[PDB]
Design a protein around this nucleic acid. Structure first.
Length: 165
RNA sequence: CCGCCGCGUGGGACCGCGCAGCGGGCGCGGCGCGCCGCGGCAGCCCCGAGGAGAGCGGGCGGGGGCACCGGUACCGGCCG
């Protein structure tokens, strides 16, 4: 239902030499560079994550202009219990908002596993969350911190920032 | 304005309880009761308390019970 979709489909047809992707989302960044999010339906996320880094690098090299990220699409419900008038209906915890945001944060940087989280409450400024990444990766991912913050802000209004420890 | 543990509206932070799929067609204005696809759902488990309980390994101890057993010494008897 757009133009980037045909290009990504062409790439996907080149890469092999049985998957399917729900949609595509493009996020702007402060610099001229932009970010693209590919929505993989939940059951196929683990299927896509076997060779995520290779897929991302091939997609970036074949078409430039913005970076590519893969995230699953999860729904959110807004009632712990739903009163049908007779019985009771309970919302599973996986559909909560807090769990979904954490899963998104984990998926954004899937290859690297988060070593910690901290949310600061400055005297006047809006509270912001800072995560902690392994010292080994460092510059291997130092060029994607701004885009990561931008996307995390876009999908979830919680602003963030990154450090290494 | 002032003798209310009752009555209605609103908020719902704190306070404590909610085991028994959903959605659509049959199907009638609506709800039941059943019958039909899974063909529409991401179907259906926070976490694992410097709380507790269970488990494996290691040594630790005048901790408990039963049987068994040595040593002088007090006392009594006897030979010289």
């Amino acid at each position: 239902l757009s133009e980037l979709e045909k290009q990504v489909a062409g790439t996907l047809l080149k890469l092999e030499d049985t998957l399917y992707i729900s949609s595509v989302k493009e996020i702007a960044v402060d610099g001229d560079k932009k970010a693209a999010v590919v929505y993989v339906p939940y059951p196929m996320l683990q299927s896509f994550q076997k060779n995520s880094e290779a897929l991302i690098l091939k997609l970036e090299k074949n078409h430039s202009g913005h970076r590519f990220i893969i995230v699953a699409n999860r729904t959110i419900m807004k009632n712990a219990y739903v009163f049908t008038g007779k019985k009771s209906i309970r919302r599973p915890r996986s559909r909560t908002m807090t769990s979904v945001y954490n899963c998104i944060l984990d998926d954004i940087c899937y290859p690297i596993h988060v070593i910690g989280k901290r949310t600061l409450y400055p005297a006047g400024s809006n509270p912001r969350l800072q995560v902690v990444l392994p010292k080994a990766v460092y510059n291997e991912v130092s060029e994607r911190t701004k885009t990561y913050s931008a996307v995390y802000k876009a999908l979830t209004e919680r602003d963030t920032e990154f450090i290494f420890m």
